[PDB]
Design a protein around this ligand. Structure first.
Ligand SMILES: CC(=O)c1ccc(-c2nc3ccccc3c(=O)[nH]2)cc1
Ligand SMILES: [Zn+2]
Length: 208
């Protein structure tokens, strides 16, 4: 059911999505091990992800969460990186895209920092890196991220350095509490709480 629509870089919708991508890059405590060394991306393509079935699945759930939370979906646009981006855009999110070993439990994880999600493009800890060169910091190979609509609803705050939600809540927010530059990270426990709206194709760029 899915079809992908290119946006022109002249479109304002492309620009703002790129802006979110570029402006949420940060340094990472692993020195660049997982996701590579870079301060910004070369954006190659941005595509709107259109799937009626998956969209209705998502809004049906949103209406449920909103009605459980004083008419407040608490909807966000967050980044997701995953070896299964192609599956995700054709079949949507489910328990097979959960991060089983994640710090907030087995769930689908999302980031405010694009560079956080970029660490998961080739797998956990960056895996063995790009398939062609086995290089976690490859500047050549094309990477892909999803920018997603995510219904957090009532989010359980966890301060820090497929399962269920903690009862009474629809998601978990990983409020970062050591690194003063790191943004929040979020976890949902049902695929229906995210829609993979944009497929961003990019290369990380070697710093000057
Ligand atoms: C292979 C698999 O099960 C898997 C796939 C993707 C991630 C992932 N984790 C995150 C954690 C925090 C913030 C963003 C992300 C993020 O964008 N992706 C984790 C595991
Ligand atoms: Zn490569």
């Amino acid at each position: 059911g899915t079809i992908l629509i290119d946006l022109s870089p002249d479109d304002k919708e492309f620009q703002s999505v790129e802006e979110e991508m570029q402006s949420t890059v940060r340094e990472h405590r692993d020195g660049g091990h997982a996701g590579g060394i870079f301060n910004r991306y070369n954006i190659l393509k941005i595509q709107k992800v259109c799937n009626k079935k998956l969209w209705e699945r998502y809004t049906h759930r949103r209406k449920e969460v909103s009605e459980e939370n004083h008419n407040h979906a608490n909807e966000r646009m967050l980044f997701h990186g995953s070896p299964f981006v192609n599956a995700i855009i054709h079949k949507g999110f489910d328990e097979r895209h959960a991060y089983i070993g994640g710090m907030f439990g087995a769930g689908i994880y999302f980031a405010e920092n694009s560079s956080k999600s970029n660490q998961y493009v080739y797998g956990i800890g960056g895996g063995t890196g790009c398939p062609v060169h086995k290089d976690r910091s490859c500047y050549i190979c094309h990477r892909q991220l999803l920018f997603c609509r995510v219904t957090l609803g009532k989010s359980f705050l966890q301060f820090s350095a497929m399962a269920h939600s903690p009862p009474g809540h629809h998601s978990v927010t990983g409020r970062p509490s050591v690194n003063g530059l790191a943004l929040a990270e979020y976890v949902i426990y049902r695929g229906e709480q995210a829609y993979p709206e944009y497929l961003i194709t990019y290369q990380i760029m070697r710093p000057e």
